[PDB]
Amino acid sequence: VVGMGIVMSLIVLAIVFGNVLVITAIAKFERLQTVTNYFITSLACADLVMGLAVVPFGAAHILTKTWTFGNFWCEFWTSIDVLCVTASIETLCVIAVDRYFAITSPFKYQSLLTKNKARVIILMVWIVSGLTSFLPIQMHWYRATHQEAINCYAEETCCDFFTNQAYAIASSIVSFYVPLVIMVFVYSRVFQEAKRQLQKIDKSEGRHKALKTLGIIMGTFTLCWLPFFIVNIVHVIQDNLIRKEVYILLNWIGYVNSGFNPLIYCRSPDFRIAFQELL
Numbered sequence: 001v002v003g004m005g006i007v008m009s010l011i012v013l014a015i016v017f018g019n020v021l022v023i024t025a026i027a028k029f030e031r032l033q034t035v036t037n038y039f040i041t042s043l044a045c046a047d048l049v050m051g052l053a054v055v056p057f058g059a060a061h062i063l064t065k066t067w068t069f070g071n072f073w074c075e076f077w078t079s080i081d082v083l084c085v086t087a088s089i090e091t092l093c094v095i096a097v098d099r100y101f102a103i104t105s106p107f108k109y110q111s112l113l114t115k116n117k118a119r120v121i122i123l124m125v126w127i128v129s130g131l132t133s134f135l136p137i138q139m140h141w142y143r144a145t146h147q148e149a150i151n152c153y154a155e156e157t158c159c160d161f162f163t164n165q166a167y168a169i170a171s172s173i174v175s176f177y178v179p180l181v182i183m184v185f186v187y188s189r190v191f192q193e194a195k196r197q198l199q200k201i202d203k204s205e206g207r208h209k210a211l212k213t214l215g216i217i218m219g220t221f222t223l224c225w226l227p228f229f230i231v232n233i234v235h236v237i238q239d240n241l242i243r244k245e246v247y248i249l250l251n252w253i254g255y256v257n258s259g260f261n262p263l264i265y266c267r268s269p270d271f272r273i274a275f276q277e278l279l
């Protein structure tokens with residue numbers, strides 16, 4: 001009777017609105033065009049596809065309980081989902097490394113990062129993301145062998161995710177773990193440098209904020225994406241261990257992280273000034 005799809009609809013609305021506003025603010029105002037702002041543009045683009053194309057279809061599968069469209073559309077949708085997730089995570093890793101190189105070596109920062117090199121870095125990230133998602137799925141390498149997967153593949157009405165051990169492990173390793181280690185090392189080094197500067201100032205002037213910022217940045221990403229990949233690894237090893245509904249719920253918890261990115265990275269006085277004029 002009552003339609004409890006409002007919670008799913010608001011997620012799409014917020015994800016579209018925030019990313020569209022960020023993209024328009026960067027594009028229209030020339031005062032915000034900076035090398036560090038191209039990575040934010042790429043991340044916003046990845047988040048925007050997902051609200052428009054993955055969440056709306058996914059909800060219909062959950063609400064209608066059937067996949068009206070064809071099997072080819074299942075393969076295409078799964079490929080887009082994997083592509084966008086891995087691209088967003090790798091963009092976050094690139095942003096962290098850029099901040100590390102900015103803070104650790106200030107004299108050589110300008111030569112290390114130029115407007116030309118950022119283009120190549122972004123293109124390499126997107127190519128690596130595309131190789132992981134489209135090529136294996138579209139060539140039918142990831143498919144399993146057990147009977148339930150075969151029956152699901154044969155029917156053109158159902159649409160469920162079944163994968164084998166090698167693809168699951170390699171996909172998790174490429175998408176999540178190496179970027180996690182890189183960001184951990186980056187932010188530990190940045191925190192050490194900040195603490196040294198604070199103690200120097202205190203020892204100079206004889207007459208918290210960094211911890212809060214790092215906590216926000218690391219904690220939102222870890223809480224959003226860490227729980228899903230653990231069960232992604234586990235469910236292959238032990239088939240009866242984890243039920244499906246938990247898998248879908250954790251995967252949808254992971255999707256919400258796309259709508260939060262403007263809250264963490266975008267805000268700043270210049271971005272606030274830009275946002276004031278548009279609305």
Ligand SMILES: CN[C@@H]1CCc2c(ccc(O)c2O)[C@H]1O
Nearest residue numbers: 078081082085161171172175251
């Ligand atoms: C449709 N759900 C998929 C299933 C597997 C998977 C996801 C995201 C990133 C990956 O590296 C994956 O291997 C999930 O979005």
